[PDB]
Amino acid sequence: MMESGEALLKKLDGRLSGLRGRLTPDTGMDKITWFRAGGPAQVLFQPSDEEDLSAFLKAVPEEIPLLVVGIGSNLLVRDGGVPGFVVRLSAKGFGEVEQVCDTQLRAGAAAPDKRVAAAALEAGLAGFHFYHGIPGGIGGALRMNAGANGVETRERVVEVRALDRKGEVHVLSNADMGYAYRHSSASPDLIFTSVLFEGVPGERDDIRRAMDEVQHHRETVQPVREKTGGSTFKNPEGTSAWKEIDKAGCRGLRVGGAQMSEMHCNFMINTGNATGHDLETLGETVRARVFENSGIRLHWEIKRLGLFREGEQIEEFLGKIV
Numbered sequence: 001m002m003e004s005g006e007a008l009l010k011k012l013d014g015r016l017s018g019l020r021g022r023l024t025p026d027t028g029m030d031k032i033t034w035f036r037a038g039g040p041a042q043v044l045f046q047p048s049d050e051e052d053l054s055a056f057l058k059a060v061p062e063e064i065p066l067l068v069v070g071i072g073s074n075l076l077v078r079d080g081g082v083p084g085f086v087v088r089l090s091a092k093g094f095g096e097v098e099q100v101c102d103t104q105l106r107a108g109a110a111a112p113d114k115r116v117a118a119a120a121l122e123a124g125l126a127g128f129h130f131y132h133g134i135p136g137g138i139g140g141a142l143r144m145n146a147g148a149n150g151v152e153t154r155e156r157v158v159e160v161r162a163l164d165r166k167g168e169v170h171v172l173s174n175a176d177m178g179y180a181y182r183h184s185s186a187s188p189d190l191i192f193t194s195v196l197f198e199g200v201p202g203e204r205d206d207i208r209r210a211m212d213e214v215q216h217h218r219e220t221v222q223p224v225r226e227k228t229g230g231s232t233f234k235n236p237e238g239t240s241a242w243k244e245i246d247k248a249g250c251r252g253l254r255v256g257g258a259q260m261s262e263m264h265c266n267f268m269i270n271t272g273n274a275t276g277h278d279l280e281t282l283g284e285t286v287r288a289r290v291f292e293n294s295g296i297r298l299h300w301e302i303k304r305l306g307l308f309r310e311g312e313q314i315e316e317f318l319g320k321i322v
């Protein structure tokens with residue numbers, strides 16, 4: 001049931017020597033995702049700088065699956081784990097946030113969104129206050145077109161810099177990203193390394209205000225101190241997920257260690273010892289009950305990921321529809 005990371009590293013004898021970032025086998029993905037659940041990643045790699053990454057992409061052959069993660073705040077990992085390599089870029093190497101002129105910011109892809117919030121305040125730049133509430137990283141924001149409070153990532157993105165699976169650099173633009181609701185059209189083999197941001201200059205007392213209103217909303221209406229991946233499902237047109245969920249009677253619904261948050265019922269909470277199966281079963285149990293109650297088929301906003309354990313597959317909607 002999944003070869004160990006040892007065996008992966010042993011087949012890759014010598015082609016990985018000369019890499020400076022850490023190579024950790026069999027790292028649970030519960031150690032690295034906000035849900036605090038999931039199975040083993042065969043090998044975790046944490047490149048030191050863009051060139052450690054580029055070297056590691058030139059080194060690993062294409063048949064081995066690669067997955068890039070940031071803070072793992074949008075991932076539901078299954079209890080069977082993730083084959084191949086999992087890449088989490090280094091904070092020290094890819095977390096820098098600096099001002100370049102008077103309207104623009106450059107941020108490495110590992111930089112937490114909240115660091116880009118503070119950096120814009122320290123530069124008098126409006127429109128970055130929505131990163132103050134999103135606990136993810138800038139690499140996932142660019143990929144998920146992350147957004148809140150009526151602002152999305154797409155509106156502050158100037159140009160993005162990435163590596164492809166052959167380790168060759170790509171400077172891509174806001175148009176190339178192909179942005180939509182929680183979506184980018186950029187190739188999925190691309191690894192974002194940094195981005196150039198641009199906001200309209202503004203008064204700092206205002207930027208504070210918006211950031212304090214952003215944070216007050218989070219602390220008051222969302223369970224953002226819990227182990228969760230955030231908003232489970234997209235809001236259906238003309239209504240909202242949490243509502244259609246509460247209507248189906250699902251506020252507080254439990255599967256094992258997983259619960260639908262009684263505070264905000266589009267959030268799934270690991271109350272301590274939830275498995276990956278617990279969370280995907282709750283989600284698809286809610287999908288099933290909301291469809292039956294409203295005919296609305298909910299769309300996942302959290303990425304499900306990895307392998308089921310033997311005899312532990314889950315059918316979308318629990319097999320009730322297809």
Ligand SMILES: Cc1cc2nc3c(=O)[nH]c(=O)nc-3n(C[C@H](O)[C@H](O)[C@H](O)COP(=O)(O)OP(=O)(O)OC[C@H]3O[C@@H](n4cnc5c(N)ncnc54)[C@H](O)[C@@H]3O)c2cc1C
Pocket residue numbers: 034067068069070071072073074075089109110133134135136137138139140141142143144145146147148182190191192193223224228229230231303
């Ligand atoms: C309390 C809470 C509140 C949230 N609020 C919001 C919100 O308001 N708006 C919102 O949109 N989301 C929200 N989320 C979801 C989550 O924060 C975002 O989806 C975010 O984009 C994920 O960031 P991450 O660092 O956790 O990335 P991960 O979860 O690790 O990965 C998410 C995606 O980003 C990709 N990715 C990450 N880094 C790179 C990279 N360097 N190169 C290429 N691809 C990369 C991964 O491949 C994956 O597809 C919330 C989550 C929580 C737990």
Ligand SMILES: C=C(O[C@H]1[C@H](O)[C@@H](CO)O[C@H](OP(=O)(O)OP(=O)(O)OC[C@H]2O[C@@H](n3ccc(=O)[nH]c3=O)[C@H](O)[C@@H]2O)[C@@H]1NC(C)=O)C(=O)O
Pocket residue numbers: 147148149150217221222229230231232233234235240241242262263264265266301
């Ligand atoms: C968290 C995410 O994005 C969030 C984002 O934080 C906020 C923007 O502030 O609006 C969306 O949530 P949302 O539609 O539930 O808006 P919220 O502000 O969180 O709550 C909506 C309103 O209904 C109230 N509310 C919500 C849930 C509940 O169980 N009870 C309740 O009373 C809240 O008090 C609030 O007044 C995004 N969710 C989706 C599916 O689009 C994410 O993508 O992971």
